[PDB]
PDB file of C-alpha atoms and ligand atoms in Angstrom:
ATOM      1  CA  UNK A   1     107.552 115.878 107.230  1.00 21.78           C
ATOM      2  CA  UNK A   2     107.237 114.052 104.107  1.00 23.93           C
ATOM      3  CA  UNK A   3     110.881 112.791 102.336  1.00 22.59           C
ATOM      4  CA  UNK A   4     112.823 114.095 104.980  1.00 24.38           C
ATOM      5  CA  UNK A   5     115.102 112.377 107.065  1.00 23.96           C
ATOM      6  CA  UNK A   6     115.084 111.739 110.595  1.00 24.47           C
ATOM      7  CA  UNK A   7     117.033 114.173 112.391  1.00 23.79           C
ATOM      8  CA  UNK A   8     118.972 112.905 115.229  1.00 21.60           C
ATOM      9  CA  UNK A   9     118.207 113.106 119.177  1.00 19.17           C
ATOM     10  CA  UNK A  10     118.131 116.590 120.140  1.00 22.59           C
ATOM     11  CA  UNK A  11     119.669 118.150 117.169  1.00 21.53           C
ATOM     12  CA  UNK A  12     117.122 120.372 116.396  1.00 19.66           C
ATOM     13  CA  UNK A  13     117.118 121.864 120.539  1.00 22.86           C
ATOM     14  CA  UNK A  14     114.618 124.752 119.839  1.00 24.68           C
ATOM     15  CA  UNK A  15     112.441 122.367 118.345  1.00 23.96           C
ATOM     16  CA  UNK A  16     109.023 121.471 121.017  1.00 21.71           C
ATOM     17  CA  UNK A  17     106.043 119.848 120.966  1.00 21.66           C
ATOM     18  CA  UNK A  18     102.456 121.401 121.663  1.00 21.92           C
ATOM     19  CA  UNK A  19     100.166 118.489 123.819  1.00 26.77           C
ATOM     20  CA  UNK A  20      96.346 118.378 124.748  1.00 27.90           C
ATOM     21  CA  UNK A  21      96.819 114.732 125.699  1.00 24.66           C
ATOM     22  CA  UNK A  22      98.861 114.104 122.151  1.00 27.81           C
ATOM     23  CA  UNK A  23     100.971 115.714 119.811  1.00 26.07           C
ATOM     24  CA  UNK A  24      99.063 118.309 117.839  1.00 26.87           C
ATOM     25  CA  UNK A  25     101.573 120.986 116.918  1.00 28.15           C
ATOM     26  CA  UNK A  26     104.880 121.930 116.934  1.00 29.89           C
ATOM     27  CA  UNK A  27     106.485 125.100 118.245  1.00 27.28           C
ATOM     28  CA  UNK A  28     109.942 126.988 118.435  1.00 21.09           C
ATOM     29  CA  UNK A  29     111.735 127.690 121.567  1.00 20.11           C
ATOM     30  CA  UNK A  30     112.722 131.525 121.178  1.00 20.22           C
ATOM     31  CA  UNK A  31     114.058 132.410 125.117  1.00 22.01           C
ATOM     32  CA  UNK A  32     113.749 130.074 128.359  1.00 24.68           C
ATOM     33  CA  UNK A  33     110.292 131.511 128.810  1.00 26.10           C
ATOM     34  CA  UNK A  34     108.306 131.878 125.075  1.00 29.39           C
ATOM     35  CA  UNK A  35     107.723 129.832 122.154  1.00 27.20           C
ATOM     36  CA  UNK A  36     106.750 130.935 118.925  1.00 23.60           C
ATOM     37  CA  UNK A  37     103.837 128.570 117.337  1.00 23.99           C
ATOM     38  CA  UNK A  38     101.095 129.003 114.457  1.00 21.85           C
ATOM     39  CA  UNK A  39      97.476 131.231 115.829  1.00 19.43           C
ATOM     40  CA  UNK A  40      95.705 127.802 114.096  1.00 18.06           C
ATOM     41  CA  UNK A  41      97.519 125.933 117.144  1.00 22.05           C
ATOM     42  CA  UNK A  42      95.911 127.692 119.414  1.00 26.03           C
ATOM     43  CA  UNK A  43      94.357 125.481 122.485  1.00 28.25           C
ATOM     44  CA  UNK A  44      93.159 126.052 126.252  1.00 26.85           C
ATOM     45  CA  UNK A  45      94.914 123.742 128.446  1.00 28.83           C
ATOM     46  CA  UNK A  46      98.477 123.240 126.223  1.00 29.88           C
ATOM     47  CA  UNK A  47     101.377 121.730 127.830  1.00 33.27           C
ATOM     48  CA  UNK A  48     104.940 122.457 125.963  1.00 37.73           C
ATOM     49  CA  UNK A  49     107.617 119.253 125.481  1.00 36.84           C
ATOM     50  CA  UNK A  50     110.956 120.477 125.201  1.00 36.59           C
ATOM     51  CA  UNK A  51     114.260 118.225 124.515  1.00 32.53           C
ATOM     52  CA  UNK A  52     112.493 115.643 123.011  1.00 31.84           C
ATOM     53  CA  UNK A  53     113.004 112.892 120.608  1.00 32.59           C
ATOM     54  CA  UNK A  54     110.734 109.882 120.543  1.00 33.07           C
ATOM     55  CA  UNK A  55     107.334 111.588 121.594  1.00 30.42           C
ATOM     56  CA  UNK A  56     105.782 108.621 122.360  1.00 24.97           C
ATOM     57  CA  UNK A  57     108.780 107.641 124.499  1.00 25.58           C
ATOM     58  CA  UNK A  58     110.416 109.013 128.097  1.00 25.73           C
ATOM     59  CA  UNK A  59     113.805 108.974 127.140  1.00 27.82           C
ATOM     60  CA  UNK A  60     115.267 111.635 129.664  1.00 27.27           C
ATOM     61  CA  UNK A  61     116.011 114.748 127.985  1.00 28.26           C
ATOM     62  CA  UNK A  62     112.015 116.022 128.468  1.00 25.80           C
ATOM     63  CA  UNK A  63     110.591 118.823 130.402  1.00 27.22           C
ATOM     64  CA  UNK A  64     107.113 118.847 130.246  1.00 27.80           C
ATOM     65  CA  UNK A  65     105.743 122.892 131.114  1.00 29.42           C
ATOM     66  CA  UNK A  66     102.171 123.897 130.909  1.00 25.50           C
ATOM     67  CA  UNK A  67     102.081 127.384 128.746  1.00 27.06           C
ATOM     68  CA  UNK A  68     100.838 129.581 131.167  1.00 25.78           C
ATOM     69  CA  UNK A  69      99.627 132.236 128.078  1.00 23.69           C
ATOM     70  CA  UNK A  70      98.933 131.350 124.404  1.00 24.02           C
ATOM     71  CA  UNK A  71      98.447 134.644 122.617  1.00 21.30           C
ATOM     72  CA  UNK A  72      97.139 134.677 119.207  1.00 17.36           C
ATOM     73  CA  UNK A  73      98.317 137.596 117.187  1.00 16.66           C
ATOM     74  CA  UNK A  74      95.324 140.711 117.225  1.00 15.06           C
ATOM     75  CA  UNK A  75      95.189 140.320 113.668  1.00 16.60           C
ATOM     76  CA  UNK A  76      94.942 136.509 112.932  1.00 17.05           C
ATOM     77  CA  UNK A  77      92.007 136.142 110.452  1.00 15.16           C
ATOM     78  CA  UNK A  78      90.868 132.255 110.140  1.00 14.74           C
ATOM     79  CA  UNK A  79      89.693 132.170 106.944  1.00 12.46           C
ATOM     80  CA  UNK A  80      92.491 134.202 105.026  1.00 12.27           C
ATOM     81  CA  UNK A  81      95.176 132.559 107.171  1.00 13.30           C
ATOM     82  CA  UNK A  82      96.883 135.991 107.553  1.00 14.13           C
ATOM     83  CA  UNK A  83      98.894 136.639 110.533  1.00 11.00           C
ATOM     84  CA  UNK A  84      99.156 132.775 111.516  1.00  9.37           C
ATOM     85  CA  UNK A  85     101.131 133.285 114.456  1.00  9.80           C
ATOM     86  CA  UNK A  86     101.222 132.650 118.288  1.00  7.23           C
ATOM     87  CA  UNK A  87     103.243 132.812 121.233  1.00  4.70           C
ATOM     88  CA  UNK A  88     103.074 130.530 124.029  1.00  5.34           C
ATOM     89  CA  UNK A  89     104.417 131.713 127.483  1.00  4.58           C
ATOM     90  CA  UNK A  90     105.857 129.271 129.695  1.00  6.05           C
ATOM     91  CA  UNK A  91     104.454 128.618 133.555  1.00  6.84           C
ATOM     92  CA  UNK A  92     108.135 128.222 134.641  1.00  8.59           C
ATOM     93  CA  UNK A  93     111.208 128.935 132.539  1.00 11.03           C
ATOM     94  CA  UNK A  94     113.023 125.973 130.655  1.00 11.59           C
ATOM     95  CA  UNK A  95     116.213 124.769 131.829  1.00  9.99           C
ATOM     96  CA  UNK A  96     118.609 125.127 129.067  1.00  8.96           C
ATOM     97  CA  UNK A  97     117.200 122.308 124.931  1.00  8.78           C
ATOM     98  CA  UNK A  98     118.386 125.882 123.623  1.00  7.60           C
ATOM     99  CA  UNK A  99     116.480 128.717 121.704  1.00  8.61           C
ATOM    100  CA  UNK A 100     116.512 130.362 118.480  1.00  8.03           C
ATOM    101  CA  UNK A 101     117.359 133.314 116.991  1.00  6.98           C
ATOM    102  CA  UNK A 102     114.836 135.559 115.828  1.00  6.85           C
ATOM    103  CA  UNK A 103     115.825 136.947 112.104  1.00  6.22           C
ATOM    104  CA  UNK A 104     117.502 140.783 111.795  1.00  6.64           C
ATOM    105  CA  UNK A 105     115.869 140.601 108.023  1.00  7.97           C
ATOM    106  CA  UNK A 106     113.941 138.892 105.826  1.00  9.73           C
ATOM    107  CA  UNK A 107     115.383 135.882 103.818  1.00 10.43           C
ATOM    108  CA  UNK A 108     115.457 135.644 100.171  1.00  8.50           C
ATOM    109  CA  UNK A 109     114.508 133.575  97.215  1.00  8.76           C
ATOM    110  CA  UNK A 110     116.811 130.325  97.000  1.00  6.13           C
ATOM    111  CA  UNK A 111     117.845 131.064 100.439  1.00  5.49           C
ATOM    112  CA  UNK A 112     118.476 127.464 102.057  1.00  6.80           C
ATOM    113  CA  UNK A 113     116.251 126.179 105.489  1.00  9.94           C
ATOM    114  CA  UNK A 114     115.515 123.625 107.726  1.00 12.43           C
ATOM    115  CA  UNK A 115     112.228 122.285 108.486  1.00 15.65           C
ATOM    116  CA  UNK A 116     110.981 119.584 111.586  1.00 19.40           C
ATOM    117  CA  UNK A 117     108.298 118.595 113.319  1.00 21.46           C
ATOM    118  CA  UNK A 118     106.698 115.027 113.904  1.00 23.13           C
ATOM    119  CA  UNK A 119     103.902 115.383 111.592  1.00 18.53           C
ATOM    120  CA  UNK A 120     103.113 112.648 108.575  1.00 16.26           C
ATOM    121  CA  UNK A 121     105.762 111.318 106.650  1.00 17.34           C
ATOM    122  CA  UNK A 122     103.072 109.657 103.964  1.00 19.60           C
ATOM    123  CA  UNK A 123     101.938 111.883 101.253  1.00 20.53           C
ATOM    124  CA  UNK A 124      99.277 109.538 100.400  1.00 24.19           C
ATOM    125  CA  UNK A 125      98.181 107.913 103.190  1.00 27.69           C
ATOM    126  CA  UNK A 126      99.039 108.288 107.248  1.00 25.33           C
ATOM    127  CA  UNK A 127     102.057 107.200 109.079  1.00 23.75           C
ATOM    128  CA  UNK A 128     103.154 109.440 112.320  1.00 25.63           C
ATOM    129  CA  UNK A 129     107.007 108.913 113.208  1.00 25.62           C
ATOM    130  CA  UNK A 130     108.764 108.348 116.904  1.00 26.36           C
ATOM    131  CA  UNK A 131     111.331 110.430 116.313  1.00 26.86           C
ATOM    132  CA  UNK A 132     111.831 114.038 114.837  1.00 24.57           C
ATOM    133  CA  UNK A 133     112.134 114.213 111.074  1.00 24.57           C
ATOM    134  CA  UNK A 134     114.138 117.290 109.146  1.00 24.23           C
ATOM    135  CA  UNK A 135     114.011 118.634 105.566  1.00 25.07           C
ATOM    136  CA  UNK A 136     116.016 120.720 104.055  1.00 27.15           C
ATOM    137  CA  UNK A 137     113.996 123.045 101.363  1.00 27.92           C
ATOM    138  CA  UNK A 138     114.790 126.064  99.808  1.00 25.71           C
ATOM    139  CA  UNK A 139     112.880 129.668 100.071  1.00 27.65           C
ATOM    140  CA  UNK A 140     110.348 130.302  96.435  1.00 25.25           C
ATOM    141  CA  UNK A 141     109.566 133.706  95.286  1.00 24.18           C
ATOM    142  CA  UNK A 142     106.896 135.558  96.373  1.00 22.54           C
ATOM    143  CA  UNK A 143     105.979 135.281  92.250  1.00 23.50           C
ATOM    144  CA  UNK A 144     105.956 131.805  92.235  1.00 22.65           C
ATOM    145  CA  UNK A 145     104.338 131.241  95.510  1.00 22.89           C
ATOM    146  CA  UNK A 146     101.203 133.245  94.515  1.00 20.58           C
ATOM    147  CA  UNK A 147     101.081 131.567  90.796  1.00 14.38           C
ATOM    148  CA  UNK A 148     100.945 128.588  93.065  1.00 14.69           C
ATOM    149  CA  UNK A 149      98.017 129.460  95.316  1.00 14.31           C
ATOM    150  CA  UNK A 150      96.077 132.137  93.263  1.00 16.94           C
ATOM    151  CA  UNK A 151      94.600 135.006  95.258  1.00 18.58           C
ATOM    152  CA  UNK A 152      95.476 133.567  98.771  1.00 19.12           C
ATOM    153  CA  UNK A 153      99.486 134.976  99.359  1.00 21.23           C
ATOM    154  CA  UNK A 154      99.484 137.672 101.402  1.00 20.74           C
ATOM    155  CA  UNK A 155     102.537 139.559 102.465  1.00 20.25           C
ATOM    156  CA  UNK A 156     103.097 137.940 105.706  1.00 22.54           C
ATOM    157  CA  UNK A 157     103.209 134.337 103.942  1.00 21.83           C
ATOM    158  CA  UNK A 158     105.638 132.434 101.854  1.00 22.42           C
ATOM    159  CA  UNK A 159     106.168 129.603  99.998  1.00 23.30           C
ATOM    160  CA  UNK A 160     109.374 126.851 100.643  1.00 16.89           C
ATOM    161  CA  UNK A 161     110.287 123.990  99.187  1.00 16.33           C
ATOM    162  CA  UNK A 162     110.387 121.886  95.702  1.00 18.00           C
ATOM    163  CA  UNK A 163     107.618 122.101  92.814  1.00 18.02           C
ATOM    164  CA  UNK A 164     108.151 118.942  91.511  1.00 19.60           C
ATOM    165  CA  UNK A 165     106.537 117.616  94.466  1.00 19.79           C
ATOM    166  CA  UNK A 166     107.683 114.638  97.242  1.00 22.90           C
ATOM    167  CA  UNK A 167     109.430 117.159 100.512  1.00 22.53           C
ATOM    168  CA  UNK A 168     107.078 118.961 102.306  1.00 24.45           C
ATOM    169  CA  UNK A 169     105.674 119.328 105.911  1.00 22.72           C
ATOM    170  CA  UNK A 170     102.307 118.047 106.594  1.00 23.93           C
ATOM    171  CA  UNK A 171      99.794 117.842 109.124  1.00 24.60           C
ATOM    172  CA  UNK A 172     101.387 117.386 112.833  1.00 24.36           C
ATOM    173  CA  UNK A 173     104.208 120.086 111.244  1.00 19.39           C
ATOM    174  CA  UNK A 174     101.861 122.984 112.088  1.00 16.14           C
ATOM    175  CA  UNK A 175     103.728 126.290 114.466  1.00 11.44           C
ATOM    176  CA  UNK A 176     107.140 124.696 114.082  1.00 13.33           C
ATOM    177  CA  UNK A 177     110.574 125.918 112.881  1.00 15.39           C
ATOM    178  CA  UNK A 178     111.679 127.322 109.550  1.00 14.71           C
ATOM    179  CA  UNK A 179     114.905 127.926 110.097  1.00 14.79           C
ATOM    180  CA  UNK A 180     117.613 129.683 107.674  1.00 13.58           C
ATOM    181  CA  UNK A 181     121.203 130.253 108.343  1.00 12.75           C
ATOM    182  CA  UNK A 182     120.482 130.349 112.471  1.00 13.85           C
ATOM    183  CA  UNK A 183     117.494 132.528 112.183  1.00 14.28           C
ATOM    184  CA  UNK A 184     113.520 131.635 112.910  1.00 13.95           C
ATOM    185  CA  UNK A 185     112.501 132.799 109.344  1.00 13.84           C
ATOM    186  CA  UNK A 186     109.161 130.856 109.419  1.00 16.60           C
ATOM    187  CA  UNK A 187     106.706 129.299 110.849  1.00 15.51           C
ATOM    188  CA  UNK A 188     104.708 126.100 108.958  1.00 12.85           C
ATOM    189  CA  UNK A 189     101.419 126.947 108.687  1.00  8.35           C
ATOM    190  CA  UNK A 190      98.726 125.436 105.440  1.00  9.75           C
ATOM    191  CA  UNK A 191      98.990 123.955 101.916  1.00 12.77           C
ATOM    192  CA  UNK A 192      97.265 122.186  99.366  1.00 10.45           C
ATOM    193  CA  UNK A 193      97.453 118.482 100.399  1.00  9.70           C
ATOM    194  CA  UNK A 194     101.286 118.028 101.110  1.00  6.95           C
ATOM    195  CA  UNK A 195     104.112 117.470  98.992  1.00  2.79           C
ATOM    196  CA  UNK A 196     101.754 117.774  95.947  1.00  2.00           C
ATOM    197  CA  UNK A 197     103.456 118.407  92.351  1.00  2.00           C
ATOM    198  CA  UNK A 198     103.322 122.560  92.086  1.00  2.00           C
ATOM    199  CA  UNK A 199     102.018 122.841  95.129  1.00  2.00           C
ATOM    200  CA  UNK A 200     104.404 123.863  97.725  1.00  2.00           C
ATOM    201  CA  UNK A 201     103.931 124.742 101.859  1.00  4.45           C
ATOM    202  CA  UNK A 202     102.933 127.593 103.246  1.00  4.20           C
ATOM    203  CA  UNK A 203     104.622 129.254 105.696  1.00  6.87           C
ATOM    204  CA  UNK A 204     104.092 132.690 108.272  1.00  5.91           C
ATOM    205  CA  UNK A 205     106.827 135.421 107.031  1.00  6.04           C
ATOM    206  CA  UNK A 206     108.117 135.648 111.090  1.00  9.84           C
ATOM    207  CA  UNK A 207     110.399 138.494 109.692  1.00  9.23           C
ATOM    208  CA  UNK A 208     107.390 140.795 109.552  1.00  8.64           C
ATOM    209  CA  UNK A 209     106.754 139.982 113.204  1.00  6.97           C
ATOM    210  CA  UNK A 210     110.257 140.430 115.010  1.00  8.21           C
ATOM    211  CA  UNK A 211     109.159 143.873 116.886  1.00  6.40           C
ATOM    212  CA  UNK A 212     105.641 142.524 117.840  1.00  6.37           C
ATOM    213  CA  UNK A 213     107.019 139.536 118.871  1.00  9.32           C
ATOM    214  CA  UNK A 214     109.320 141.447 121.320  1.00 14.09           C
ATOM    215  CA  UNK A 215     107.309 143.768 122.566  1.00 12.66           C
ATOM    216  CA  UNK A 216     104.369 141.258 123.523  1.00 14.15           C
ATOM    217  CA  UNK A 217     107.079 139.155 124.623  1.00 11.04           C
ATOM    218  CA  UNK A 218     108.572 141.918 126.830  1.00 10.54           C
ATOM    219  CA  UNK A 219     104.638 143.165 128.053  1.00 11.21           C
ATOM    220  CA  UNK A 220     103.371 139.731 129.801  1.00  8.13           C
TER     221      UNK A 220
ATOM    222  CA  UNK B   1      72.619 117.611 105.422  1.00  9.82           C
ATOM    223  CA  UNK B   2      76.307 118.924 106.769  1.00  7.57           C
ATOM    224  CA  UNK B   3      76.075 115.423 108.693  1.00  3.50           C
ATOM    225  CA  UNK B   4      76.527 113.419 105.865  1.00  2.57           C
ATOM    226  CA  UNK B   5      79.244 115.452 104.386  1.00  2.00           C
ATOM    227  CA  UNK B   6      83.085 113.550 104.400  1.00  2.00           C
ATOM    228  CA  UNK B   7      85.127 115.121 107.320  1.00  2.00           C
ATOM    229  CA  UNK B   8      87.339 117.687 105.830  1.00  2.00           C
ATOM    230  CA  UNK B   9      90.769 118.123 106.991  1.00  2.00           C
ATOM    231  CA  UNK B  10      91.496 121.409 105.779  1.00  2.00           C
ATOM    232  CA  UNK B  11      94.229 123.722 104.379  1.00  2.00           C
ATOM    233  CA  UNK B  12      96.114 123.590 107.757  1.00  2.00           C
ATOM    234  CA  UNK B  13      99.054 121.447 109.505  1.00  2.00           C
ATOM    235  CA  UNK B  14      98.135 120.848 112.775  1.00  2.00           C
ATOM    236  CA  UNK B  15      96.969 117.196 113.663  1.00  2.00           C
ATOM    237  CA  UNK B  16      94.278 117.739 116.059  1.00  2.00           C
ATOM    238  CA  UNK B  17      91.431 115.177 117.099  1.00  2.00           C
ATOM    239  CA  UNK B  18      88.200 115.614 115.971  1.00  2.00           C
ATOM    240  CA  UNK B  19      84.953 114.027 115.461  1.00  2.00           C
ATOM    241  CA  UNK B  20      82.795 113.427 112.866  1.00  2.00           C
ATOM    242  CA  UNK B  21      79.782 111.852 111.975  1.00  2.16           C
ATOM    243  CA  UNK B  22      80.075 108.746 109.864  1.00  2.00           C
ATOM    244  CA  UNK B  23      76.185 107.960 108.336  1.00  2.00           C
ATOM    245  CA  UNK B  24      77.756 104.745 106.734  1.00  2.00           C
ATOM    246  CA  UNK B  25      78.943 103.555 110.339  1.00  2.00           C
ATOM    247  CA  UNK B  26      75.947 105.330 112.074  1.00  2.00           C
ATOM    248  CA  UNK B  27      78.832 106.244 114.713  1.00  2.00           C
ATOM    249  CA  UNK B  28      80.386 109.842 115.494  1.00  2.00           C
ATOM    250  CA  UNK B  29      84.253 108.745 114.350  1.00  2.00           C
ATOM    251  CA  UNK B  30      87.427 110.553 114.920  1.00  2.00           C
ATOM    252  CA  UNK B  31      89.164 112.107 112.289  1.00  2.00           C
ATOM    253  CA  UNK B  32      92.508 114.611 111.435  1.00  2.00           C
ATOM    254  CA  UNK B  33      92.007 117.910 111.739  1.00  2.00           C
ATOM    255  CA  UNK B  34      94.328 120.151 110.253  1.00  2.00           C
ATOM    256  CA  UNK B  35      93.392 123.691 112.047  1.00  2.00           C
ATOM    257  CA  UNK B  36      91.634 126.028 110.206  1.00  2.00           C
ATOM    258  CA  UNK B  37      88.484 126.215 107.628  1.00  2.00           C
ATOM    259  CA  UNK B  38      86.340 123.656 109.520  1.00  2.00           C
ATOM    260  CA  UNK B  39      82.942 122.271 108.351  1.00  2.00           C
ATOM    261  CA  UNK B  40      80.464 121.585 110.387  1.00  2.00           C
ATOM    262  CA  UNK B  41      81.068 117.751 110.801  1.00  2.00           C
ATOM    263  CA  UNK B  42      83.704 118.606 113.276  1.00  2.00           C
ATOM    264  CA  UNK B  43      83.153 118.404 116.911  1.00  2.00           C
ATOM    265  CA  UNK B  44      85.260 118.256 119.471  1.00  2.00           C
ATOM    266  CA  UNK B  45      83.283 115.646 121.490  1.00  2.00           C
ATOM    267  CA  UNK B  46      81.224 112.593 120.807  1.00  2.00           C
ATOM    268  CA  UNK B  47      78.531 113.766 122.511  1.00  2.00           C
ATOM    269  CA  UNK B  48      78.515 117.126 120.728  1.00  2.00           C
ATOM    270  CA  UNK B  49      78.642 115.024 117.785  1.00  2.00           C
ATOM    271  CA  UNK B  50      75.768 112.794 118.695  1.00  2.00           C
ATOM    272  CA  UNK B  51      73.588 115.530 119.691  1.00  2.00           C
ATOM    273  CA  UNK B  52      74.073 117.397 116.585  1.00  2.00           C
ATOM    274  CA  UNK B  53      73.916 114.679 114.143  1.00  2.00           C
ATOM    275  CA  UNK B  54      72.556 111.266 115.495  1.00  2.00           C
ATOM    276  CA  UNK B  55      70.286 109.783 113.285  1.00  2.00           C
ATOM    277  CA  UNK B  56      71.582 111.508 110.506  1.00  2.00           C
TER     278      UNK B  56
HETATM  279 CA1   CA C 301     110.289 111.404 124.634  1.00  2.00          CA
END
């Protein structure tokens, strides 16, 4: 997260981390046994970190559980980015750390949201944080998000945050939470660069996915 | 030669391992991947590096 601010231990409770060895990815705690990531997150071998705060730290709070499925939606194309979106099953069911709501409509324009994950904080230039990092950025038109990114917006995509550049996600933010007024709206998924002047993030429209999501939810 | 090509990040957010190979160096090196839209430098081993574009 790049000019954000750092969020506070536990805060953000529906908030994990995906890890083959390290942090790669976020995710969003959506019931004590499923999380809700990006399809580009997608990994054999994945174990989940709930409650935490400092990843590179045991502070207590943690439970580590291996995902026990990682299912990529049917229609994820990697080269259009359409349908970016995953859900992880849990091996055993989280002890709750607390999950979030999935959305009863889309949001609109303007609408405000947080965003978190433990990705970059340097726009130019690398520096990982300890501790979880939050931004608050609003929804963009779907008008303004394809002027953006010519030719690449489809209908299960939108665009958050400022155009004047300096808040965005970035990488190590991939799968995790956008959240708006209690609801999982999206899910951070690509950009150009981050936090670049008229070039705002990405992110997977999770309204368009609330009755897949609970039927392949409810089916394994 | 896709050896000698920079590593490319990509479009994505993830922050996944990878390695490339670094003709400079003459050393498969470890980069950030962001997810999606790989090139070819991009392996997800040394070896598979080294056997693919040692001596690049
Ligand atoms: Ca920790």
């Amino acid at each position: 997260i790049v000019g954000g601010y750092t969020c506070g231990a536990n805060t953000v409770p529906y908030q994990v981390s995906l890890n083959s060895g390290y942090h790669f990815c976020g995710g969003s705690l959506i019931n004590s046994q499923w999380v809700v990531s990006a399809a580009h997150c997608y990994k054999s071998g994945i174990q989940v970190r709930l409650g935490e705060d400092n990843i590179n730290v045991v502070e207590g709070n943690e439970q580590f559980i291996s995902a026990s499925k990682s299912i990529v939606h049917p229609s994820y194309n990697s080269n259009t980015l359409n349908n970016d979106i995953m859900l992880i099953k849990l091996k055993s069911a989280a002890s709750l750390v607390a999950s979030i709501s999935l959305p009863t409509s889309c949001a609109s324009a303007g609408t405000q949201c947080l965003i978190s994950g433990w990705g970059n904080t340097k726009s130019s230039g690398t520096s990982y944080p300890d501790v979880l990092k939050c931004l608050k950025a609003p929804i963009l038109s779907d008008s303004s998000c394809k002027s953006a990114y010519p030719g690449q917006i489809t209908s299960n995509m939108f665009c958050a945050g400022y155009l004047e550049g300096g808040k965005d996600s970035c990488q190590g933010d991939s799968g995790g939470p956008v959240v708006c007024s209690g609801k999982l709206q999206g899910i951070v998924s690509w950009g150009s660069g981050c936090a670049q002047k008229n070039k705002p993030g990405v992110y997977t429209k999770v309204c368009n996915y609330v009755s897949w999501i609970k039927q392949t939810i409810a089916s394994n | 030669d896709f050896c000698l090509e920079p590593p490319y990040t990509g479009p994505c957010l993830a922050r996944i391992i990878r390695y490339f190979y670094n003709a400079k160096a003459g050393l498969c090196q470890t980069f950030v991947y962001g997810g999606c839209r790989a090139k070819r430098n991009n392996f997800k081993s040394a070896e598979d590096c080294l056997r693919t574009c040692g001596g690049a």
